[PDB]
Short mmCIF file of N, CA and C in Angstrom, two decimals:
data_model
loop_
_atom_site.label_atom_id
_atom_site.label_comp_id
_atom_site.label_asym_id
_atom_site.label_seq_id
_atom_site.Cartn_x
_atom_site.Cartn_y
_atom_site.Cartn_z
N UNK A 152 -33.19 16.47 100.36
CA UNK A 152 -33.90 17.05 101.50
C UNK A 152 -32.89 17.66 102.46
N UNK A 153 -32.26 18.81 101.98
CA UNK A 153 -31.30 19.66 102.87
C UNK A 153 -31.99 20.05 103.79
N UNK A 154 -31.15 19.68 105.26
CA UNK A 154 -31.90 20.20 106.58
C UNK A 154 -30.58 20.88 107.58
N UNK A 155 -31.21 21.91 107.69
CA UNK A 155 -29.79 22.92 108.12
C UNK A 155 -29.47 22.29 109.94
N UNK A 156 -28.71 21.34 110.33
CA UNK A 156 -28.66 20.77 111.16
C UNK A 156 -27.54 21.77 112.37
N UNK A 157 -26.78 23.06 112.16
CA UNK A 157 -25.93 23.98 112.55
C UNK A 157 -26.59 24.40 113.48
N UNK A 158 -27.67 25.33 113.61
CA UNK A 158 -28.06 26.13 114.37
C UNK A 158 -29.04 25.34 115.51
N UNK A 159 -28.53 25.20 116.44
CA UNK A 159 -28.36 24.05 117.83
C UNK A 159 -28.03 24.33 119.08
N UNK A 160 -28.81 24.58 119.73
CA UNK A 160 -27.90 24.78 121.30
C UNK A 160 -28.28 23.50 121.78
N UNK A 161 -27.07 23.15 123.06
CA UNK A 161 -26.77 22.43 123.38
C UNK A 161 -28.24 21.88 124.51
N UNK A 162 -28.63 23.28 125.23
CA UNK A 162 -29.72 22.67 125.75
C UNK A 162 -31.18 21.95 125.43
N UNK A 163 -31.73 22.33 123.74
CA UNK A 163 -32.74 21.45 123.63
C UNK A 163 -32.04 20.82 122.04
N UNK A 164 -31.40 19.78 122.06
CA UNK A 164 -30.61 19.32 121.44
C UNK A 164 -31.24 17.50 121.18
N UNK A 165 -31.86 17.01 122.09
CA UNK A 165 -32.47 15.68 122.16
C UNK A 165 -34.52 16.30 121.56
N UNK A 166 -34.38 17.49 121.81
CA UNK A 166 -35.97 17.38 121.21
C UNK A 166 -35.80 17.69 119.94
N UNK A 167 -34.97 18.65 118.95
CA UNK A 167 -35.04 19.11 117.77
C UNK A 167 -34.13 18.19 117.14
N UNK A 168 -33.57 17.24 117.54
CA UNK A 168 -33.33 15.89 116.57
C UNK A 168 -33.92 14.62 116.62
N UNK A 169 -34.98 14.55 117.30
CA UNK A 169 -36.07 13.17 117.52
C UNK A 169 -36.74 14.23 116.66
N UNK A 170 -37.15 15.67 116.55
CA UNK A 170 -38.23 16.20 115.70
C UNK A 170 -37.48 16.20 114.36
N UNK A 171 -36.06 16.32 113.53
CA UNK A 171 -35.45 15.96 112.90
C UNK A 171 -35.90 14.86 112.02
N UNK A 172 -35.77 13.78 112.75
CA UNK A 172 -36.17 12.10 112.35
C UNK A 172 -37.34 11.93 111.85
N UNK A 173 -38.40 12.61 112.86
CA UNK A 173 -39.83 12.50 112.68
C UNK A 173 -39.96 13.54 111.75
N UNK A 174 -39.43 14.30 111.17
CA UNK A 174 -39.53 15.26 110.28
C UNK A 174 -38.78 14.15 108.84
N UNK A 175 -37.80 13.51 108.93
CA UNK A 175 -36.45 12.74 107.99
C UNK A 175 -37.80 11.57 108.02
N UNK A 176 -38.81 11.15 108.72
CA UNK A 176 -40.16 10.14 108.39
C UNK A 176 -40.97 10.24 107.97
N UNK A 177 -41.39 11.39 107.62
CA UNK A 177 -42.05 12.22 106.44
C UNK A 177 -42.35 11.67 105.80
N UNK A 178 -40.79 11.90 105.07
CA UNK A 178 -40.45 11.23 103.57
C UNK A 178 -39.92 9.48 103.96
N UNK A 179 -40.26 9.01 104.80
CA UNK A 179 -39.55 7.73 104.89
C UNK A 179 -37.65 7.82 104.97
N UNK A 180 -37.43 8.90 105.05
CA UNK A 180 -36.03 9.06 104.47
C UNK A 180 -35.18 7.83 105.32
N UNK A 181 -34.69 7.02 104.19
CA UNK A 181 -33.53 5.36 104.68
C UNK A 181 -31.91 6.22 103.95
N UNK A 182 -31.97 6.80 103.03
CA UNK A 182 -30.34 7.72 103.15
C UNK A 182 -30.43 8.72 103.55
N UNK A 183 -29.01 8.67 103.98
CA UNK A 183 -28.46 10.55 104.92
C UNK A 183 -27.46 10.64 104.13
N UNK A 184 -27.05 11.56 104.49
CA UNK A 184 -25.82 12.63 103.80
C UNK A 184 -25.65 13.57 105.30
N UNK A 185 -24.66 13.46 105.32
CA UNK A 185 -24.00 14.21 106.84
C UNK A 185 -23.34 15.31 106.88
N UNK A 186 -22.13 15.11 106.14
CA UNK A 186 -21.37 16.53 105.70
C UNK A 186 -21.17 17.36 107.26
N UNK A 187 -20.32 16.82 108.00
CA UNK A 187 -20.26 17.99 109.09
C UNK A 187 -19.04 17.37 109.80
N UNK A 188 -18.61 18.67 110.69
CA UNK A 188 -17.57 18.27 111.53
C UNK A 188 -17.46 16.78 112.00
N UNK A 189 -16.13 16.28 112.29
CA UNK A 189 -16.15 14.55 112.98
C UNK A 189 -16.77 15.39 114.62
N UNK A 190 -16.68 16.61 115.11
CA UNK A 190 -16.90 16.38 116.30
C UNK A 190 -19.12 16.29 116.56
N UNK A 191 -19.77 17.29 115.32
CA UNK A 191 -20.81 17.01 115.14
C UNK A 191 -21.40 15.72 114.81
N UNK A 192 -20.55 14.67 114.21
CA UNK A 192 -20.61 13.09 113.58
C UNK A 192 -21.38 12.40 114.68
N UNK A 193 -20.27 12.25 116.11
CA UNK A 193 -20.60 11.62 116.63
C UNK A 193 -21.72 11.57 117.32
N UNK A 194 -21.78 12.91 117.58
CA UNK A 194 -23.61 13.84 118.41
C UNK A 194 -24.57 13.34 117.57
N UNK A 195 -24.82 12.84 116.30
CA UNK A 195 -26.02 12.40 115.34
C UNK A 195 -26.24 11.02 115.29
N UNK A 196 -24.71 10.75 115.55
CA UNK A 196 -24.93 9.08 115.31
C UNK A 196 -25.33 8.47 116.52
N UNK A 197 -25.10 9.35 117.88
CA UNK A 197 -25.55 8.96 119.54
C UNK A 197 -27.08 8.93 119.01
N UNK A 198 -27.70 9.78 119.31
CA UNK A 198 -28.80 10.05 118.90
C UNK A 198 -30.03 9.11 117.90
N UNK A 199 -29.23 9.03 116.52
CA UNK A 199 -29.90 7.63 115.85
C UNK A 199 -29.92 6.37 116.26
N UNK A 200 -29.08 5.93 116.99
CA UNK A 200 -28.81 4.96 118.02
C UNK A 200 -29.85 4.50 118.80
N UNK A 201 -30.33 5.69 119.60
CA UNK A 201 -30.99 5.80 120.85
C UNK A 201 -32.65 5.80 119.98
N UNK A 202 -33.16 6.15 118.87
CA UNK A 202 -34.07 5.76 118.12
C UNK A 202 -34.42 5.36 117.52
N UNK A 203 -32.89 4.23 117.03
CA UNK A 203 -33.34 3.05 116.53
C UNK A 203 -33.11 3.16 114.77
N UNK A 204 -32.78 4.10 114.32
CA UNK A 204 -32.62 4.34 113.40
C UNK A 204 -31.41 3.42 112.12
N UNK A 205 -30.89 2.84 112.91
CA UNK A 205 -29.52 2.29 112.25
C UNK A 205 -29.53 0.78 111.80
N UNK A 206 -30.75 -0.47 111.95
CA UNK A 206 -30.98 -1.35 111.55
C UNK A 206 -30.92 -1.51 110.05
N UNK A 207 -31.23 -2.91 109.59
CA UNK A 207 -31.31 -3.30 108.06
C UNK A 207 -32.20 -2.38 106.87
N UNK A 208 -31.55 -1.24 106.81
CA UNK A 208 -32.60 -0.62 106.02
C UNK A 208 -32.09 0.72 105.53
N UNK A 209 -31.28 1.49 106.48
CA UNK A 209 -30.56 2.96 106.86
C UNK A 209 -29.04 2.62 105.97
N UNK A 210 -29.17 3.73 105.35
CA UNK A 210 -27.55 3.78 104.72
C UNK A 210 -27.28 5.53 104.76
N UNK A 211 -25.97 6.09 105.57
CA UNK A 211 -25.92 6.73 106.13
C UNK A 211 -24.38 7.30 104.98
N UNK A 212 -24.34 8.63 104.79
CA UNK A 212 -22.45 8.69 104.25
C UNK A 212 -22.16 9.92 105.08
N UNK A 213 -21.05 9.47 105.69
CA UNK A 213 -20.12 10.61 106.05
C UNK A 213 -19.16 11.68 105.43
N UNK A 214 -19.43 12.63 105.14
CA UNK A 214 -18.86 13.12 103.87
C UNK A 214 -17.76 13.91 104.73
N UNK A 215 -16.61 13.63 105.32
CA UNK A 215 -15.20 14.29 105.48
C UNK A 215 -14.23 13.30 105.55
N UNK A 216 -13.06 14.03 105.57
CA UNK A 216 -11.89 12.86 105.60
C UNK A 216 -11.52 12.22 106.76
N UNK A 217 -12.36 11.98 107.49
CA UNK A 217 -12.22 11.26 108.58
C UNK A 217 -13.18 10.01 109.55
N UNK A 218 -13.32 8.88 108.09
CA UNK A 218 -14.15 7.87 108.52
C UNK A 218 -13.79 7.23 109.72
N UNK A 219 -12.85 6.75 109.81
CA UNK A 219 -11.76 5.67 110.98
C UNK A 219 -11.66 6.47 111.86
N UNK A 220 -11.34 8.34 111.95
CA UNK A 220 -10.72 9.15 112.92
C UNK A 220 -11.49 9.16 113.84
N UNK A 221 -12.96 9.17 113.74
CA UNK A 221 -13.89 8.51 114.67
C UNK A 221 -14.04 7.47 115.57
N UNK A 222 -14.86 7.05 115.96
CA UNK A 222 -15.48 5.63 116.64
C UNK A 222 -16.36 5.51 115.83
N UNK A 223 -16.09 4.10 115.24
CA UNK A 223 -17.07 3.29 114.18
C UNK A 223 -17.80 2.27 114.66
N UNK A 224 -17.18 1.13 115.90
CA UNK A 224 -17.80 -0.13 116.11
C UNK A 224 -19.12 0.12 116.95
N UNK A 225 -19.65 1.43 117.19
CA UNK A 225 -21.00 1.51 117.77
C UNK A 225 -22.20 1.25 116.75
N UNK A 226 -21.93 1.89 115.84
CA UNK A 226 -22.46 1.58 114.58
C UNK A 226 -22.51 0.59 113.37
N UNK A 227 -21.82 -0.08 114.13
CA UNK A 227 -20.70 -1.65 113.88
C UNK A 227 -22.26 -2.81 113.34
N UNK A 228 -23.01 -3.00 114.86
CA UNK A 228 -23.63 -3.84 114.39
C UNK A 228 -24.99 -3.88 114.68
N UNK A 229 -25.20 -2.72 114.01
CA UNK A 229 -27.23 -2.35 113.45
C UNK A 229 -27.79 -3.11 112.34
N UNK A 230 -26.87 -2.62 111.52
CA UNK A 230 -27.54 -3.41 110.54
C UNK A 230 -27.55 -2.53 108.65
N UNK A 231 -27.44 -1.22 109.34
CA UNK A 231 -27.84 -0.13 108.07
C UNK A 231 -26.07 0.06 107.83
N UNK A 232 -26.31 -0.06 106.21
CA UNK A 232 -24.82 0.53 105.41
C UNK A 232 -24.27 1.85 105.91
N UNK A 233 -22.80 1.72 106.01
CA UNK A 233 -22.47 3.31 106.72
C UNK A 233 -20.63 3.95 105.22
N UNK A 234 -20.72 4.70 104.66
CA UNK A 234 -19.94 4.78 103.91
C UNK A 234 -19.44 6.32 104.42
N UNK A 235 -18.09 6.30 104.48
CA UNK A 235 -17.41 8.19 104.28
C UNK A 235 -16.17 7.63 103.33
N UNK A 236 -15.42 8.88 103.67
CA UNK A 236 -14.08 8.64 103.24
C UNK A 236 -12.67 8.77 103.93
N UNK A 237 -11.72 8.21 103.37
CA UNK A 237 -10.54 8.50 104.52
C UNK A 237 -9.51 8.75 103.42
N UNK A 238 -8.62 9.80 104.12
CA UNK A 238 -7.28 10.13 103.02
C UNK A 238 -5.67 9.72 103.79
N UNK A 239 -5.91 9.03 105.20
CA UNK A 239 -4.52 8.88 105.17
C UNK A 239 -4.73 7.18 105.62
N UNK A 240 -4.41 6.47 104.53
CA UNK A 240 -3.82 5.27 104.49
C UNK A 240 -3.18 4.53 105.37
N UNK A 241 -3.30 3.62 106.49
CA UNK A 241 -2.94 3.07 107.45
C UNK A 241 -2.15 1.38 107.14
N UNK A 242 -2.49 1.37 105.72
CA UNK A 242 -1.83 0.03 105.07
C UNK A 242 -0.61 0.40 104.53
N UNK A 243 0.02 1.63 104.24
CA UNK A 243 1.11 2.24 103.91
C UNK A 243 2.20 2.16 104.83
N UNK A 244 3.55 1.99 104.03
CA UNK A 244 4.72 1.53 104.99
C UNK A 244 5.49 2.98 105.81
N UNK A 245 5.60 4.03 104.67
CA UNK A 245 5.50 5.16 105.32
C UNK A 245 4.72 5.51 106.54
N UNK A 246 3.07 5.65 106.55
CA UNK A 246 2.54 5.68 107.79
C UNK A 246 2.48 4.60 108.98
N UNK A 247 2.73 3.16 108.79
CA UNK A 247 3.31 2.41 109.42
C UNK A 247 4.68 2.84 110.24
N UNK A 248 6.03 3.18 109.74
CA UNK A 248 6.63 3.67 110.28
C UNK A 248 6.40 5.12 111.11
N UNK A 249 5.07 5.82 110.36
CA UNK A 249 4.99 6.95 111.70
C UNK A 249 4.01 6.22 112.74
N UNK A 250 2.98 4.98 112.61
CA UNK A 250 2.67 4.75 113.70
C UNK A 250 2.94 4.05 114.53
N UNK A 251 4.23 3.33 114.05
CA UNK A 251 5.23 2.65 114.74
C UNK A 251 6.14 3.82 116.23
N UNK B 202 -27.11 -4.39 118.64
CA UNK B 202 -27.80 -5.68 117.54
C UNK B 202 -28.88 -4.50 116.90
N UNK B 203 -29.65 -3.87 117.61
CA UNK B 203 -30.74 -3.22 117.08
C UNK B 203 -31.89 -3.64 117.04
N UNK B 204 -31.96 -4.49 118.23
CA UNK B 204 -33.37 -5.39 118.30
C UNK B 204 -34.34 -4.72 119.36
N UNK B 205 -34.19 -3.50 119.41
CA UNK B 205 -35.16 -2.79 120.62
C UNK B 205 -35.97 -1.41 119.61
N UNK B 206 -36.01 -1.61 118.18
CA UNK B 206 -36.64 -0.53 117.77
C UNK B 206 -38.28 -1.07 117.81
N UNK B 207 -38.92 -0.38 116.95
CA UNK B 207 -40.68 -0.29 117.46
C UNK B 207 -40.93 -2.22 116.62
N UNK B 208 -41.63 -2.66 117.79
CA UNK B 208 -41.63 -4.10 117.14
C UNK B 208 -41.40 -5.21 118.31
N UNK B 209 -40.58 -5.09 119.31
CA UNK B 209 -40.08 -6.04 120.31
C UNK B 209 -40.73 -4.86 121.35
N UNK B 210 -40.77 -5.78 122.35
CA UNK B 210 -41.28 -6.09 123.86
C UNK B 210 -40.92 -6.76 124.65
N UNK B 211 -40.29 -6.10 125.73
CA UNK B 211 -39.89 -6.95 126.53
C UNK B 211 -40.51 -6.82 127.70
N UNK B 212 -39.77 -7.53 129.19
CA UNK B 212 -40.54 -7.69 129.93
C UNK B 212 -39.59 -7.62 131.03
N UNK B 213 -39.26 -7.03 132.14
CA UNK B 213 -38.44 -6.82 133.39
C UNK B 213 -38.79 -7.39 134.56
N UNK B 214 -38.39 -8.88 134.60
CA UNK B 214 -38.62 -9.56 135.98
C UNK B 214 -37.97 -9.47 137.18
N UNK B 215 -38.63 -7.97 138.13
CA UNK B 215 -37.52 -8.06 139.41
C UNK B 215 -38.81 -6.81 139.78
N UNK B 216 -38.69 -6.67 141.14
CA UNK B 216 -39.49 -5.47 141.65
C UNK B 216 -38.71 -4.23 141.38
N UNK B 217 -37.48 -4.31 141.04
CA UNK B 217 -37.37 -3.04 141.02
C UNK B 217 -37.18 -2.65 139.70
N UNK B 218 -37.60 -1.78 139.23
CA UNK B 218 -38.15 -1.28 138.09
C UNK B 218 -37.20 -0.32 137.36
N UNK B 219 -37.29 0.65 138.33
CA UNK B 219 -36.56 2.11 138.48
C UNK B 219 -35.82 2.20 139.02
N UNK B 220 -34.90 0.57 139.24
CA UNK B 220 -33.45 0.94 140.35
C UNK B 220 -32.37 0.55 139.70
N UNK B 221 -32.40 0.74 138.19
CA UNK B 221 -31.26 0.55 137.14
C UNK B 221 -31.79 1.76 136.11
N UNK B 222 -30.54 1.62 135.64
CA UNK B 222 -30.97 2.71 134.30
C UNK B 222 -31.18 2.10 133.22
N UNK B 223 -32.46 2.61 132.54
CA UNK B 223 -33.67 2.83 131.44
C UNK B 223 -33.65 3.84 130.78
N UNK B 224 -32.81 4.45 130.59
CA UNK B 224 -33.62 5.85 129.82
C UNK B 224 -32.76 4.72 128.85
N UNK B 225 -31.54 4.26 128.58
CA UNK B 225 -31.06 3.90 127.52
C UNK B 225 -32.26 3.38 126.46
N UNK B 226 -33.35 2.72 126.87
CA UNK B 226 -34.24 2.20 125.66
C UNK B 226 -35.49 3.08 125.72
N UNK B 227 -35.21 4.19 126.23
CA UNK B 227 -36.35 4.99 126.45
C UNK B 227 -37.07 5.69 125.30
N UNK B 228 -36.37 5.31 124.17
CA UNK B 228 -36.31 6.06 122.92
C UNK B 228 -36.61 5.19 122.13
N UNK B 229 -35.99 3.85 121.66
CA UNK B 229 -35.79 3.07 120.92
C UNK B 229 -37.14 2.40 120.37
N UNK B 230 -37.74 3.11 120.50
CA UNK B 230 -39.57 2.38 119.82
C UNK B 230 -39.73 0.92 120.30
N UNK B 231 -39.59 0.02 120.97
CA UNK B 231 -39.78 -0.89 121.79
C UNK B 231 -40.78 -0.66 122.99
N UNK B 232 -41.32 -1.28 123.55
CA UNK B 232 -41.70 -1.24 124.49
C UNK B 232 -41.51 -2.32 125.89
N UNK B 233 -41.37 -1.64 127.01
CA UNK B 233 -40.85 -2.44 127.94
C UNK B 233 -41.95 -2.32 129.13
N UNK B 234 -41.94 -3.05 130.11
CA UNK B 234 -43.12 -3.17 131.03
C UNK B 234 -41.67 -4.01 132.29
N UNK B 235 -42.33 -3.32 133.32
CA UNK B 235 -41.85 -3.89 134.85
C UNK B 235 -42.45 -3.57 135.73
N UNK B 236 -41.76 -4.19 137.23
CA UNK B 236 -42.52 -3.85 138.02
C UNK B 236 -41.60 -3.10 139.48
N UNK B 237 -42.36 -2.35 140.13
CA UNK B 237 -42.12 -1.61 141.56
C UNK B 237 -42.65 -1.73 142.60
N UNK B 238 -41.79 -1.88 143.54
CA UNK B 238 -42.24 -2.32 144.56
C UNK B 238 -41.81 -1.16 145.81
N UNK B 239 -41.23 -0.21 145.56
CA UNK B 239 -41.07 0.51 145.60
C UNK B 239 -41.51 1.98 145.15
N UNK B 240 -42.94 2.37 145.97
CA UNK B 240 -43.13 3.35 144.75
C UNK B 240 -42.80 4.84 145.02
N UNK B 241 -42.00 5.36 144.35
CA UNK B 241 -41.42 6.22 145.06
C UNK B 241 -42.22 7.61 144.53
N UNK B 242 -43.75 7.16 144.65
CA UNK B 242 -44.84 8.49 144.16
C UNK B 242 -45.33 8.53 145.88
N UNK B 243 -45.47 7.27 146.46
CA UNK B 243 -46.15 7.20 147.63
C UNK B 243 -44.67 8.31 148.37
N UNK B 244 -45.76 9.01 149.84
CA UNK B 244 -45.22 9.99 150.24
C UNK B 244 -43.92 9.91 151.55
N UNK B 245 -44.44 8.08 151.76
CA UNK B 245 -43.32 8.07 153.16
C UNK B 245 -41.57 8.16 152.00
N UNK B 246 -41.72 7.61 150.90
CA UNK B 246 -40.70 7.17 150.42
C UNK B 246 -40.04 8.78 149.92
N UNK B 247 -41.10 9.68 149.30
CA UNK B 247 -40.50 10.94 148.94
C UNK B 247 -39.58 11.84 150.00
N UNK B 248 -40.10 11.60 151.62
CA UNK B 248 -39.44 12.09 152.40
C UNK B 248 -38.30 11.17 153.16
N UNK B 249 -38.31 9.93 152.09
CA UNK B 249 -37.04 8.80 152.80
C UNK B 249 -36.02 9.45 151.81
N UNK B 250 -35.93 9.64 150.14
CA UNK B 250 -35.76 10.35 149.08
C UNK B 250 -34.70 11.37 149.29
N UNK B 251 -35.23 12.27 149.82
CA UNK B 251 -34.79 13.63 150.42
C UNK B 251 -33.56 13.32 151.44
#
């Protein structure tokens, strides 16, 4: 269920993503697929938050290389599975010494 | 926690109702009930307001 989530202005931005949801309730939809900028990430995940969306049931994937580069612990403890991916390794002694 | 989606109810014991911020669960399919004692529809208060 591709939903072209891009074309957005900033001013009615809280009505065409509660109509989003209620549109994503349709279908019952409990997975997402995100695929978008980390700076768009966080604007969707405010939002599901605020409607409740993120409890025992919601499994959500972030599809760029920047799971951690975010803020995660808001989403910490709802309840719904949250999966992306990350490519730079923070258990590595190399990047240890650069974040040293 | 996520305990304010549609399902829970709560209940706001204090007169003032509308003298903290709410919009935070304003969304969250819950429903909440309080009370005012203060009503700031009545007209002396709209021109205290101002």
């Amino acid at each position: 269920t591709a939903i072209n989530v891009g074309n957005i202005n900033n001013d009615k931005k809280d009505e065409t993503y509660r109509s989003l949801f209620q549109d994503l309730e349709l279908k019952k939809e409990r997975r997402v697929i995100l695929d978008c900028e980390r700076d768009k990430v966080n604007d969707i995940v405010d939002q599901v938050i605020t409607i409740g969306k993120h409890v025992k049931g919601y499994h959500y994937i972030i599809a760029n290389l920047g799971f951690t580069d975010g803020d995660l612990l808001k989403i910490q403890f709802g309840g719904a599975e949250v999966s992306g991916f990350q490519i730079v390794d923070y258990d590595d002694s190399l990047v240890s010494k650069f974040i040293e």
